[PDB]
Amino acid sequence: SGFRKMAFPSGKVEGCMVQVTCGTTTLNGLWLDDVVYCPRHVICTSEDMLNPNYEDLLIRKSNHNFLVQAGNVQLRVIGHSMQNCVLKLKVDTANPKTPKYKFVRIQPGQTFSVLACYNGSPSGVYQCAMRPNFTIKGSFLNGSCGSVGFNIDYDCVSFCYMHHMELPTGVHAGTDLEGNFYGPFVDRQTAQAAGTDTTITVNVLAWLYAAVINGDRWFLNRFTTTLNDFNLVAMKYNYEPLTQDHVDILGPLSAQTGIAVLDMCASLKELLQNGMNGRTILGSALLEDEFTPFDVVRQCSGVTFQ
Amino acid sequence: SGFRKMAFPSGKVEGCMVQVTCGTTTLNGLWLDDVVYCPRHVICTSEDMLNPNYEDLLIRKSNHNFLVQAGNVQLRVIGHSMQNCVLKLKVDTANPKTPKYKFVRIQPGQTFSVLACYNGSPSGVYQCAMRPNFTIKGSFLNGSCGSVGFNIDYDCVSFCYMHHMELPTGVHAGTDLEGNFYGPFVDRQTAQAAGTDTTITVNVLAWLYAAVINGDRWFLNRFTTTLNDFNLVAMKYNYEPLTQDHVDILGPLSAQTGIAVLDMCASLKELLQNGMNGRTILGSALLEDEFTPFDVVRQCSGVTFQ
Numbered sequence: 001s002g003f004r005k006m007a008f009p010s011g012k013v014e015g016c017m018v019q020v021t022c023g024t025t026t027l028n029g030l031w032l033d034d035v036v037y038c039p040r041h042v043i044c045t046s047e048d049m050l051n052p053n054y055e056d057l058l059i060r061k062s063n064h065n066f067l068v069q070a071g072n073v074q075l076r077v078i079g080h081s082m083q084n085c086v087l088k089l090k091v092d093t094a095n096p097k098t099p100k101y102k103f104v105r106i107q108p109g110q111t112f113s114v115l116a117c118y119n120g121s122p123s124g125v126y127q128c129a130m131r132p133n134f135t136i137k138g139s140f141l142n143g144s145c146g147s148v149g150f151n152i153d154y155d156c157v158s159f160c161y162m163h164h165m166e167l168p169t170g171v172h173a174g175t176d177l178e179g180n181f182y183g184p185f186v187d188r189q190t191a192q193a194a195g196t197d198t199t200i201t202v203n204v205l206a207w208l209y210a211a212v213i214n215g216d217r218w219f220l221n222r223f224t225t226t227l228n229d230f231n232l233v234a235m236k237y238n239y240e241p242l243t244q245d246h247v248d249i250l251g252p253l254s255a256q257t258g259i260a261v262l263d264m265c266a267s268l269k270e271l272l273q274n275g276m277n278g279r280t281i282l283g284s285a286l287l288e289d290e291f292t293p294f295d296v297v298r299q300c301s302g303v304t305f306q
Numbered sequence: 307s308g309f310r311k312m313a314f315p316s317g318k319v320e321g322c323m324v325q326v327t328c329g330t331t332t333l334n335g336l337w338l339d340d341v342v343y344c345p346r347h348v349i350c351t352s353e354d355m356l357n358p359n360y361e362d363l364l365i366r367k368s369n370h371n372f373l374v375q376a377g378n379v380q381l382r383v384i385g386h387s388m389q390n391c392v393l394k395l396k397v398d399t400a401n402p403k404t405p406k407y408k409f410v411r412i413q414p415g416q417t418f419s420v421l422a423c424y425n426g427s428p429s430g431v432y433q434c435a436m437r438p439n440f441t442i443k444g445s446f447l448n449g450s451c452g453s454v455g456f457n458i459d460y461d462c463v464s465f466c467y468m469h470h471m472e473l474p475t476g477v478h479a480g481t482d483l484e485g486n487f488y489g490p491f492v493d494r495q496t497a498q499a500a501g502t503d504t505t506i507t508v509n510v511l512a513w514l515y516a517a518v519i520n521g522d523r524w525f526l527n528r529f530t531t532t533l534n535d536f537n538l539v540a541m542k543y544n545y546e547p548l549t550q551d552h553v554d555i556l557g558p559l560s561a562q563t564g565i566a567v568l569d570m571c572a573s574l575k576e577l578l579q580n581g582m583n584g585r586t587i588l589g590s591a592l593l594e595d596e597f598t599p600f601d602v603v604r605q606c607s608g609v610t611f612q
């Protein structure tokens with residue numbers, strides 16, 4: 001029993017982190033096979049960053065201008081190219097610790113683990129959700145750029161996020177590993193703002209199921225609802241719509257607990273209209289939306305990796 | 307910016323996890339140098355666990371009754387001894403992935419990362435504290451015993467916790483790596499209840515400092531207090547007493563923010579006497595007590611390892 005915000009074990013990713021330096025700018029890079037991926041603004045100085053012409057900056061660069069360090073191993077760079085907001089440095093050694101991997105673009109609502117790094121070294125690991133406004137509520141300082149987010153499926157690492165920047169309310173934005181931003185952000189130091197965020201409904205429902213599994217049942221009521229009536233209430237509380245796909249994905253938890261998804265929605269509806277009355281659910285005094293249905297299953301069933 | 311419950315990178319510990327099997331009982335073991343450490347109740351069947359005579363269970367066994375697996379490979383057990391509530395198996399092969407390490411016995415209020423494991427494989431990583439009542443608020447299922455808790459400082463892993471059992475209300479109990487239980491617990495399936503828990507005051511103050519560093523300053527009030535007067539309020543709210551050692555440990559955060567420790571105590575006092583009135587601090591609707599002063603500085607200054 002117990003329910004915690006749980007990250008994937010970080011070992012397979014730790015063996016892929018390197019330091020990439022160009023001039024006086026250092027950030028993190030990801031070393032997979034014979035390619036090092038990092039944010040393209042490794043080629044900027046803090047003056048350039050205010051308004052960079054990345055193509056113009058890149059023309060003036062050559063292989064030897066890119067210092068790549070993997071622990072104390074200096075890698076020889078033998079090629080470079082830009083792809084969207086990411087640089088790809090070809091190196092002359094394949095990373096012997098490359099795991100099975102793929103690049104994925106995640107959707108809002110989906111969770112992943114971040115391995116926050118400085119100077120090519122791990123600081124820590126924590127779980128994040130891609131918010132509906134395409135930000136993440138991370139913990140990042142200067143130098144964290146190039147840290148990655150990922151999921152593990154048995155032995156396979158799915159990389160979904162590379163860190164680029166922080167937005168006004170101390171939330172974070174970045175790209176997939178093909179260098180395309182999540183959200184309408186750009187890699188420039190100019191005023192930008194996240195849109196209105198909303199609560200990830202399917203996730204809150206998952207977490208209510210985790211609470212039931214743990215014997216925290218006080219919020220179960222005697223009502224049911226319809227998807228359409230539920231969505232009316234959701235939208236007035238700035239919750240995402242619940243779709244049939246969400247219902248389908250909640251099926252394992254539904255079947256495990258014997259609680260119809262629509263009955264749980266009716267319980268959530270009451271919680272939204274009446275508040276929590278200072279009570280807690282799984283230790284929290286707010287409704288938690290950064291656990292996916294899969295996260296709850298993995299945690300409650302003790303799924304392992306590696 | 308941002309402030310998250312951050313675990314240590316787990317790669318160093320992932321390389322030490324093995325499975326120990328005695329008869330039909332399998333649990334996790336930790337393989338450091340030529341020794342494997344695991345809960346002594348690996349020598350129990352489900353029937354033995356009501357009131358095991360560990361001496362009698364052990365005295366029958368020989369080296370050969372212990373199966374140690376790392377991946378596919380069997381390690382040859384060439385010695386065994388029981389120390390308190392842990393078994394130590396000497397194997398004929400030193401772990402090639404052994405990190406620099408020490409064993410430490412932590413104090414209530416100190417935090418650590420747990421690498422939850424099943425069948426000798428990692429399931430995930432999360433941060434916990436040693437509660438004042440010597441329990442931890444974990445996430446553990448059947449098969450988790452032998453999972454360990456740790457801190458890293460630079461390249462050195464300090465192991466502090468090995469998982470043994472779950473108490474009522476879904477909280478957890480275990481030993482140091484010398485096999486000595488934290489708190490008054492015993493490794494038998496018998497009526498055991500944790501003492502009333504209290505709130506780690508010094509940690510709440512650290513997190514309030516974290517909040518200020520991140521711009522969340524609404525709770526800074528217009529008062530100060532004395533240690534004596536504050537401690538009267540803490541006692542009333544089942545908070546631990548704050549000592550002068552705690553005030554000293556908060557020195558760095560105090561000096562960084564220009565906010566005297568006693569002024570922060572006074573702000574906390576107000577929070578305790580008035581409640582938070584639905585407000586949040588760092589996204590939490592409750593006062594968080596599972597970040598140490600060191601945790602805050604580590605996170606806010608981006609300390610790395612490895």
Ligand SMILES: *[C@@](O)(c1nc2cc(Br)ccc2s1)[C@H](C[C@@H]1CCNC1=O)NC(=O)[C@@H]1[C@@H]2[C@H](CN1C(=O)[C@H](NC(=O)C(F)(F)F)C(C)(C)C)C2(C)C
Binds near residue numbers: 027049164172
């Ligand atoms: C990152 O680690 C990087 N640092 C540098 C330093 C140099 Br000289 C070159 C390139 C990079 S990339 C940081 C990470 C962030 C610092 C604080 N917390 C973080 O998550 N990224 C940045 O500094 C990016 C970077 C430049 C500006 N910026 C920002 O994050 C910020 N945002 C914005 O200007 C705005 F769009 F408003 F949101 C900044 C510094 C927080 C004001 C670019 C986006 C390329």
Ligand SMILES: *[C@@](O)(c1nc2cc(Br)ccc2s1)[C@H](C[C@@H]1CCNC1=O)NC(=O)[C@@H]1[C@@H]2[C@H](CN1C(=O)[C@H](NC(=O)C(F)(F)F)C(C)(C)C)C2(C)C
Binds near residue numbers: 345451452494
């Ligand atoms: C652990 O993984 C172990 N499982 C086994 C199985 C066998 Br056949 C032998 C030895 C072990 S050690 C679990 C972990 C816990 C299960 C639920 N969540 C957990 O964290 N440990 C236990 O089963 C321990 C173990 C036996 C009983 N027990 C308990 O955790 C609880 N004991 C209590 O009665 C109490 F005192 F409350 F703490 C139990 C099973 C949850 C009722 C011993 C203490 C040796």
